[PDB]
Each structure stands twice: as structure tokens, then as C-alpha cells.
RNA sequence: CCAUUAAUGA
RNA sequence: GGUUCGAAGACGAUCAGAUACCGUCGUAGUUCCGACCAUAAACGAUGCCGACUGGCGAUGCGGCGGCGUUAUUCCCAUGACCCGCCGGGCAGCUUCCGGGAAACCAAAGUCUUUGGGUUCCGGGGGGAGUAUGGUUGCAAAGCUGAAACUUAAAGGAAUUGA
């Protein structure tokens, strides 16, 4: 990642970043998220620097691969945008998913049935998953967060500045992170593109599901 | 912590944060050892050796954790110098 | 202290000399009004003459008729 | 009688693949099982009850008195704790206080005053601790002095093994719960104060969760 | 107004150490401040610093580490002999192992162990540990 | 006031979760089915459980139920998750590019690209909701 | 104890305002402390608009209004149920009630 | 009420001043 | 619209 | 000079009683000028000056920079809007910086790891802001200001019932 020709930024990755809209940040501005924005556009929407986004994705991929056991890595999403993304990420990696209904106390209450003592937390949204930050304040749990330009950095541990609102952008960044950790650990080589299509990770509107069911038959 | 003879006499030696240069107490239950992996320059895969880092709880509850991790990784050579 | 100068010793001494009088024990020890109003006169014992014997009703919850002597 | 493990650290204790609680205090792992300290330091561990405090709340059918137990716990070498538990009966209150005390013991620090020959005896520097308005200050003392203190924190320091210490108290020290928690916070911050003898860099050893990560998934879920 | 420039600068670096900044800009530059910073340098509590010397009250940038617990000040400049310095380090320093009380003398601005070596008392300035 | 309690409802959910194939739509059939599969000591509680089973089966025929784990609905959920659509909306011949994004891409390594389309900037800086 | 940050009123740097008499009582209230209702009022609301729309001379004549800025005190506002007491966690929520009806 | 206690004491002070001024 | 007061100790 | 309102006072109601709340009046007063007194829950119950320590959306002042809309239309430039920046002015929102007994406080923080400089003021509650002495004032009153004696409580924050 540091002056390495292998871990550079790819032209197709630039095309998919521009097609998803991950650089298109939020309207407001956070005081901690100032060092990941190059220039403010017209209409008051910030530009997330895609190269520094790729660098923070590489560092979070280092943090994922450095954990030896993939089974005790909890990947969390409470909004409806990221549930299918974290479920298919856990199915592709070996992680443990949370897709809605995060019970407060799964990291602190032992008598509960869904008690886990993990080694790594990967957070979709900080304001939606502020409660795993509160359990990670008491259990020694590192935090990976897909932050926005407005998302604060309270109790997080490493962050990737992205657009946490667009359903294409969130799933595209989960796809980039999943392909990066599969290229790092000894499963999939870096020469060929990955076979499973990145539209698998996108959450579908049920109106779009009914429209596709109408258009299929 | 050595005595007149020179023996290590304290019953443990505490951890120290690599960002604020401050030790970590016994019930500082938010201190995290970050592990950064390594990538070979000719293969591009995981090697086996790590880079360890300490984060105390005050930096987490303040909000300067990932900035300190980014600065330590840029100093140790993980993040590129362009950034 | 409040003022922390290098030569405020007379100010601190005069302020503490004026504020010792607001203590109850210092005033009772260093004014002669309480020593004059003390029937013993700063003494421990005193002889006197019995003139009458008074039954004094007691205070709050504990009630009795105590036996005092006007000396 | 046979203890069934629940936590991962408790499973490591039942596997005996960690040599002491020193690595647990190094990596700051939360101890949430009361049998771990009975396993490690349970031979010389001592329980002494400080005060049974009868707190109560007012209901519509009079008052409801429930007893609050304070237990000072610890062997005479380096590790003590203070446990607080309020329950309906005093026996269950003292038992729960001993359990929470075993969950929340802390390591205490002993150092030298001036000459550094022999074993460490005193608190190495002027430290302090407070909760509420009770302020307890711990002062280094020379050799042969003793624990010049009130009887309850003198009992706590006699448990802690600090032979020589001067103390200072500020506030309404009649509240023995806040008084014991204030001296508990002082002896906990002894191992939190930055000592200039700790200028050596910390070579971080491997966590036991990362050491035995294969046994922890092959012997149970 | 600004009465004690040394006390203001040391309270500034004390606030910087309490928050956790890597470096801080204290706004004036005095000779007592520069000599105090060199004493903390030679005793190894802070890093190496620099001063910005315009033709006014200059500025000072000090690279800070976590080895400085609290940097205080003793105002005003009390006289300290060799008979009372034991009581000074008894009621001001945290221990007799570390911590140094600076005090200016005619031989130079120095701390209490160097004052015991050179056998010379003087006016106290502050403490640092 | 005809409201079922938790001892009816949780037991009926366990019955439908474990024996979904044996249960049906008719009340007088799945009542006897629940009688044979579950030991219910009273006819009134048996009728309450059977009625709540019929009402949950009506909810299943109307749509999905949250507090249930049916194997067929789980297989349908897994199929709808593993469904692969047609070619992506990320692969487009025309991608709208803002001028400041074009400037930062020029400052990066890939400055000139193949299938990008730079657009005009939104003139008029009016993007905030008025106050009050 | 100090119950409100702005102490029961809307003064922070003024210090003194002019008094206004109440409408229900004749209580002398400070201007920024008084509960103010800018009551809009169509002179007929439901019943007589149907009568005026057929008894008026001009075709499609718009009905007039009557604007009154009422000033109440704390006692008059709570006795006429303009404002109510709230929980201490909901005291700081100074959003106005909406215009749903 | 402290206000009427102060006003009662002012009237009592006026009575004391009048009874001293009579002498 | 009017509505005053519940003797001391436990 | 007295329009309105309205201490004292009169009258009519309610009440066992009203020498109050309610209503009709109504003197002094409330309005202006020349002389008094210096008292307020005169409060932000938080003295004045100086340095440091999170941001966020504003607003007011003056200045600066930059797409554009709109008037002097006949351009530049000045007025009105939009986005920022600069110094403090009243402020507001979040909060494990930190403090406090807590309510709360970006100060009520930089406090047992106690020292930036400086004026006033408190030493349990009553007696009591009382007596006396001095002083100011036409008076009412204001400033300084006790003691004897009496009591083990008085008080502040917060919790649960009623």
C-alpha cells in the first residue's frame, strides 16, 4: 500500500466509483472529516477524495486480514440499505452478520443467547450503529466504519469515507472491500476479475422486485 | 523499576499508547491493539508478520483514533507518502 | 489565600487579623464581654447560697420534672 | 460445584493455557466470572466485610429495607478489591458483594522511597482518588513508618501489602462507601499514573485470544 | 493584563499536555521560558523545540511527548535556601525519585539536584514532572 | 374482549415452526392435528391455540410473517437474495462528471478517460431550506 | 434551583423591557415573558358561511378576517390551557406545535 | 414573611426612638 | 361561585 | 396640570366573620421642572483584567474574496439576496475534554498533579441588620455595627411514596 505497484488504484475501480457516486458526499460538514475532502462543489455537496478512500480501504483490509480467525468478525448493519450487503459479505468471507434488530447487550450480557466476544467490528453507519460503539467502549473491540462527510468519528477506530446513503454506493464499497480482502488472503489471485457480479450486494426496493417479477414473465 | 540489585521487581509492566505516549491501566477496557497486516512486494498476499499499535480509551472517546492510526501507518510505511 | 503577591504580608496579616474575629471561639476567648457575663469569671467552681428550689419542666419528647436550685 | 465456562477468557482459564492474571491485566480484558480469581489467587484470598448499610425506599405500604454490603477482598500481595452489593437479605448481599469484588479486583502498586534496596514497600509517588466529595490522597512514606491512616483504609492497605503510606482525607468521610471507593480509585490510579521509570518502549506481546484461536473454535462453538 | 508570562506559557503547555496535542504554540518568548524549556530538554520530559524570532516578543513551538505529567508554576518568586529545599521538594514534588523544582540562581537557572550539587539557593520559578 | 395471551401465542408459533407441513387451513382439521402433536390439557386452551394457528396461517397466505422461521420461506428468501440480475447500471457508456471531479481526476493518475461525459456546473448557489 | 437557562423569559442581554397588560387578567408582564398568540379568525367559520354565500349582494365576495395578538401570562395561559407542563427531558424541546388542524 | 417582619421591626424601632426621645 | 381546623410522646 | 389608572377612605356583594380577593367611586400618587434619600429577586443570585482548552447552525457590526438574480439601466460602481473568511457582541444545540454534592457549567474548566494578578465578602441557625456610638438627610430612613441569652440542628441538590 505504501509505494507499491501491486496495490495501486485501478481504472475500472475509478469507473465504478464514478458510476456509484461514492465521492458525492453529504451536504453538511463534520469537524473530524476535514482531511478526507478535497473541494466543495456547487449546491453544497463535498467531494470525498477517492485515492485516500482507497488508502483507508487498504488499511481496513490490512486490519481484516491480520485477524487470523474469520469466524469471530462481526459485520453490523441496522439500516435497510446494508443488510443484504453485510449478509453476502459474511457469506463470502466467513464473518458473522448482523442484519437488523441489534440487541443492546450482545457483547456484555453473558446470559443472553446471542452472546459473542468477537475480534473485529465492521460498522455500516455510525449514527445507525452508535450502540455497537457503546459496547466496544467496554469490550476491547476495534471498529471499521463506512463513514460519510457528516458522520462523526466518536468511538470509531478506523474509518473509510464514503457515501452511506446511496444504495449503489454502499454496496459498491462493500464489494470493493470484499474483493480486496479476497485478493489479500490466499483464496483469489489478483490477475483475473472476480466472477460474482457486484449487483448481488445491492439492496433491492420491493417495488423494484415486483417490477422485475412483472418484467420477467 | 529496577532495585539496587537490578531485578525487575514490579509484578507487571503496563502497555503504552503509541499515539499519546501514556500508559494503559488495568481496567482501561477501551484500549485496543490494532494489528496491521503485511503485503509482499512481489506476490501481493499476506505474509505472517504484523504491525501492532495501542489505542487508549481517551483517544477513542475524544475522536482522534483513526487520525492517529493513519499518522502511525504513514510513519511506519503502510500508507503511501502521497495520501 | 486570595492575593498572591511578593510583598503582601501586611495585607494578608491585616485581613486574617480582621477575619479571626468572625470565628466564635476566637471572639469568646479574646473579648471580655463573655468573660464578664460568665458567672464563674473564667473559673471552674464557685460557692454560693441556696435561696429556692425550682421544679423545671423538661423539653421535647423526653418529659420529666427536673430539680434545679437557684444559687 | 463443577464450573461450566461461559466466556472465552473463562474457557482459557479452564484450559489452563494462561499462566497468570498478569497477561489479563496487561491486555485489559474484562473479568466477568467470579471463579477466575478463585482459581488463580483463591488460596490466600481473604474476605472482610466493612459495613452493612441499611438503605430503604418508601412504598405505599410503608418502607422496604434492603441491606447493602461492602466487602474488602484480597490476598496480602499486590491484588485487592472493593465490592458493593445491595440485596434483600444480608447473606445474599455479602455473597453478591464477594462475587462482584472477585469480578472487580484491581492490582495495586508498591515502590521505593529514596534508597531502593530490598523489596518495595511504599506508594511510589503522591497519588489521589475521589468520588463524591471524599478525596483520599496517598503519600510516599519512609521505611519503618507504618500505615498512618484511618482504620478502614489501613485495613485496605494492609490487604494491599503497602507497609508504609501516609494518607490525607478531604470531605465528609463518614460516608464509608464513598470513602472506600475513593481510596479504591487512588490505589487503582497508582497503576494508571505515568511513571518516568516507564520510559522504555512497550514491546507488545501476542494476545492469548490470538495465540489459542484454534483451540477456542475446535473445543466448543 | 498579562502579569506572569512564564505562568501563562506553562499553563498553556499544561492544557496542551492534558488534551494530548503533539505540539503547541505558546505566544510570547521570554528568557526564563527558553531556559526552562532547555532544562526540561536536558532532563528529558519534552522533545526538542524551536523559537520563531521576530523583533517583538517572539513565538515558541514545542514538540510535546507524553512524558510530561503536569507543568506548574510557583508564583511569586520565593527565596529558597539550602535548609528549606527539602521541605519544598517534600510539599511540591510527587516523589524523591523523579520530578524537578527549577529555581533561578546567579550561577544559572537550574533545578534542585543541581542546586544541591553547586551549593547555591535562589529564587524559585516553578516545578515540572 | 377476545385477546390471546403469550402462553397461547408462543406455543402456537412453536407448533407452526416445527409442524408447518402437517398444518393447513381448515380449523377442524388443524385443531385435531395440534391435539395429536401437542399435549394440551384442556379443550379451551386447545381451541385458543388452534384459532391462533388458523389466524397465523391466514397471515401466511396473505404475506410474510416476521416472527416465524418457515423453511420454504427461508428457501425463497435465499433464492431472492441469490438471484442474479441482467447487466449492471454501473457499466454505462455515458457517465456524468462534475468539473471539480474532473479536476481532481486530472490531478490523480487517470486524468483522461474513455467513457466519461463532463457536464456543466449548477449555476446559482441556492441549496438551503429557508428558516422558520 | 435554577429551573430554566433563560430564566422563565427570553432575556439574555437586554436587562429591562417594557411591561404589557394581560388580556384575561390585567397582569403586568414583561414583553419577552408573555405568551403571545397571533389569533387569526375568519368572522364566520362553519355555519354562517353558507348563509352569507347566498345572502350577500356581491358574487363570490371573500370573507374578511380579524387578527388579534393576544398576550397572556403564565397563570392565564395555563388556566386557559394555552401552555402545559412538560417533563424535564422535554422542557428544552422548544419546537412549536404543527398545523395539522 | 421577612418583608413584614422587617416592617414590623421598623415600626418597633420607631416606637423605641419615640420612647427614648420622651426622656 | 364557598371549603376553616385536625392536642402532645411512640 | 390632573386624561386614564389608583395606596388611604366610603358603599354594594360572598363569607360564621373580610377592617381582603369581586364591583362603583375615590385623596396622595402616577405626567413635567428645581432641590432631596440611595434603597430592589439592583440577578446572570456567577466582580475586573490576562493566556489556553471540542465543534455545529446562526444573527448583529465593519472589512475582504468569489457562480449568479434583481434596481440606479446606459456598462463600471454602489443598494438588496447566495457561499465562505476575519475580531468580539448578545446568544442557542451535542458531548466520558474537565469540574461540582448534584442540578448544571466551553465556564461554575485549566484544584490534594493544590500558587496568573487584584478589591469586596462568609465561619452552625436565631437574637439581628437589633441596641449603642459616630455620620448623612426636612422626614421616612441610609452607612458602620455588636453583645448578653437560646438551640442540635438550620440549610442546598437529588431519589421513592403520599
Residue numbers in the entry:
A (entry chain q): 2 to 218
B (entry chain HH): 1 to 83
C (entry chain VV): 2 to 72
D (entry chain v): 58 to 278
E (entry chain TT): 2 to 130
F (entry chain YY): 2 to 133
G (entry chain ZZ): 2 to 102
H (entry chain n): 2 to 24
Sentences from the paper on this structure:
XBP1u has two hydrophobic domains, HR1 and HR2, and a C-terminal AP of about 26 residues which pauses the translating ribosome when residing in the ribosomal exit tunnel. During this temporary pause in translation, HR2 is exposed outside the ribosome exit tunnel and can recruit the signal recognition particle (SRP). As a result, the paused XBP1u ribosome-nascent-chain mRNA complex (XBP1u-RNC) is targeted to the Sec61 protein-conducting channel on the ER membrane, where mRNA splicing by IRE1α is now possible. We show that the XBP1u AP makes extensive contacts with ribosomal tunnel components and forms a unique turn in close proximity to PTC in the ribosomal exit tunnel.
We structurally characterized the paused ribosomal complex (XBP1u-RNC) by cryo-EM and single particle analysis using a mutant version of XBP1u (S255A, full length numbering), which was shown previously to pause ribosomes more efficiently than wildtype XBP1u. Processing of the cryo-EM dataset yielded a total of 531,952 ribosomal particles, and multiple rounds of in silico sorting for homogenous populations resulted in ~60% of programmed ribosomes, with the major population of ribosomes in the non-rotated state (~42%, P- and E- site tRNA) and a minor population in the rotated, not yet fully translocated state (~18%, A/P- and P/E- site tRNA). In both states we observed strong density for the XBP1u chain, which was connected to tRNA and extended down the ribosomal exit tunnel. The average resolutions of the paused complexes were 3.0 Å for the post state and 3.1 Å for the rotated hybrid state, respectively, with the ribosomal core reaching a resolution of 2.5 Å. A major portion of the XBP1u peptide in the exit tunnel was resolved to between 3.0–3.5 Å for both classes, whereas the resolution in the part distal to the PTC near the exit was worse than 4 Å, apparently due to flexibility of the nascent chain. In both states, we observed that the ribosomes are paused with Met260 connected to the tRNA in the P-site, in full agreement with findings from ribosome-profiling analysis of mouse embryonic cells. In the following sections, we will refer to the post-state paused RNC complex for further analysis and discussion, since the nascent chain conformation is indistinguishable in both states. Since we detect a substantial fraction of the RNCs in the rotated state we cannot exclude that the XBP1u structure may also perturb translocation as well as preventing rapid A-site tRNA accommodation. However, we do not observe any perturbation of the P-tRNA 3'-CCA end pairing with the P-loop in 28S rRNA, as was seen in other cases.
